[PDB]
Amino acid sequence: FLVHSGNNFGAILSSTNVGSNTY
Amino acid sequence: FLVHSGNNFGAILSSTNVGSNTY
Amino acid sequence: FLVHSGNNFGAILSSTNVGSNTY
Amino acid sequence: FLVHSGNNFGAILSSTNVGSNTY
Amino acid sequence: FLVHSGNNFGAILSSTNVGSNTY
Amino acid sequence: FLVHSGNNFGAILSSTNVGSNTY
Amino acid sequence: FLVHSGNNFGAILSSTNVGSNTY
Amino acid sequence: FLVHSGNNFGAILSSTNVGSNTY
Amino acid sequence: FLVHSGNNFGAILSSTNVGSNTY
Amino acid sequence: FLVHSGNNFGAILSSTNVGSNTY
Amino acid sequence: FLVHSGNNFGAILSSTNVGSNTY
Amino acid sequence: FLVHSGNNFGAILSSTNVGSNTY
């Protein structure tokens, strides 16, 4: 079980793995 | 089980894996 | 089981894997 | 099982794999 | 089982695999 | 069980793992 | 006198006045 | 007199006045 | 007299006046 | 007289006046 | 007389007047 | 007379007047 709720990410660059990950 | 709800991502560049991943 | 609900992605460039992935 | 509901992707360039993938 | 519901993709360029894929 | 609620990330660069991870 | 030479504009959306204007 | 030479603008959104203007 | 030479603008959003202006 | 040569602007958001202006 | 040569601006947000201005 | 040569500005936010100004 997990939640990824409500995020505001205004700007993102050159990145890895910004969201809900599991198992 | 997971959720990926409600995100606002204004801008994204040159990125990997910004969303719900599992198993 | 997973959900990919409600996203707003305003702009995206040069990216991989921005959505719901599993197994 | 998965869902890919409700997305708004305003603009996308030069990208791979922006949608629901599994197995 | 999967769903690909409700997407709005305003513009897309030079891209691969923007939709529901499985097995 | 976990939650990733309510974040505002104004800008991010050159980063890894900014979101909810587990197991 | 002006010049508008050599531009490459890969993609443009929802914009005004992207070219040579005068008087 | 002015020049607008050599620009490469990869992507642009929701913008005004990206080019050579005068008087 | 002015020059606007050689620019590379990779991405731009929600902006005004990114180019050569005078008088 | 002025020059605006050689710039690389990787990403820009929500900005005014990023280029050569005079008189 | 002025020059605006050689700049690299990796990312910029919410800014005014990042370039060569005069008179 | 002035020069604005060689700058590297990695990231900038919420700023005014980051470049060569005169008279």
DSSP, residue by residue, E4-22: -BS-EEEEEES-B--S---
Tokens of H3: 């020049």
Can you tell me whether residue D11 is helix, strand or coil?
strand
Nearest to A1 among F1, F17, F19 (CB): F1
Cβ neighbour number for residue K18 with a 10 Å cutoff: 26
Q: Are K19 and L19 in contact (CB under 8 A)?
A: yes
- Closest partner residue to B4 among C3, C12, C17, by Cβ? C3
Q: What burial letters (b/e) apply to G1-23, b meaning 16+ CB within 10 Å? A: ebebeebebebeeebeebebeee
Chain G nearest-CA distance from H8, in A, is: 5
Whether the CB of H11 is below 8 Å from some CB of chain C: the reply is: yes
Q: Identify the experimental approach.
A: cryo-EM
Closest Cβ opposite residue A4 in set B5, B10, B12: B5
Tell if the CB–CB gap between E19 and D17 is shorter than 8 Å: no
Cβ atoms within 10 Å of E19's Cβ, excluding its own: 13
Q: Does J12 touch chain A (CB under 8 A)?
A: no
Inter-residue contact A12 to B11 (CB < 8 Å): yes
Is C13 near chain H, with CB under 8 Å? yes
| Distance from C-alpha of K8 to C-alpha of K16, rounded to nearest angstrom | 17
Picking from H7, L20, E4, the residue whose alpha carbon sits closest to that of residue J22 is L20
Interface residue A12 vs chain J (CB under 8 A)? no
The Cα–Cα gap between H9 and B14 comes to 17
Q: Are J17 and K17 inside 8 Å of each other by CB?
A: yes
Contact flag G1-H2 (C-beta cutoff 8 Å): yes
Secondary structure (H, E, C), H1-23: CCCCECCEECCEECCECCCCECC
Task: Tell me the C-alpha distance between B12 and L22, whole Å.
Answer: 35
What is the DSSP track for L1-23?
A: ----BS-EEEEEES-B--S----
- Rounded to whole angstroms, the Cα distance separating I17 from H16 reads 6
Between CA C15 and CA G3 the distance in angstroms is 36
Give SS3 for K8: strand
CA dihedral J2, J3, J4, J5 (to 10 degrees): -170
Q: Closest to L13 (Cβ–Cβ): which among K2, K8, K13?
A: K13
Report the Cα–Cα distance between both ends of chain E, in Å, rounded. 10
Asked if H11 reaches chain D (Cβ–Cβ under 8 Å), the answer is: yes
List of chain B residues whose C-beta atoms are within 8 Å of the C-beta of residue I11: 11, 13
CB contact under 8 A, D15 and C18: yes
Q: Are C5 and E3 in contact (CB under 8 A)?
A: no
Residue C6 · residue A7 · CB < 8 Å: no
Counting every residue written for chain E, the total comes to 23
Check if C12 contacts H (Cβ < 8 Å).
Answer: no
Tokens of H18: 């990206």
Cα C17 to chain centroid distance, Å, stands at 7
Q: Which residues of I1-23 form beta strands (DSSP E)? A: 8-13
Q: Do D13 and H13 touch (CB under 8 A)?
A: no
- From residue K4, alpha-carbon distances to D9, H1, H19, L1, L20 in Å are 36, 18, 17, 12, 7
CA atoms within 13 A on the CB side of A8: 4
Reported resolution in A?
3.9
**How far, in Å, CA of L4 to CA of K22, rounded?**
13
Buried b (16+ CB within 10 A) or exposed e, F5-18: eeeebebbeeeeeb
To which H or E segment does residue G12 belong?
strand G12-13
Q: What is the DSSP secondary structure assignment for residue J13, as one 8-state letter?
A: E
* Rounded Cα gap, residues A16 and C19, in angstroms: 13
Show Cβ contacts of residue J5 under 8 Å, excluding neighbours closer than 6 positions.
I3, I5, I6, K3, K4, K5, K6
Write phi, then psi, for J2 (nearest 5 degrees).
-155, 170
What does each C-alpha distance from A17 to B15, E3, E21, F12 come to in angstroms?
Answer: 8, 23, 21, 12
CA distances for B4 relative to A12, A19, B10, E6, E21, angstroms = 18, 8, 16, 15, 18
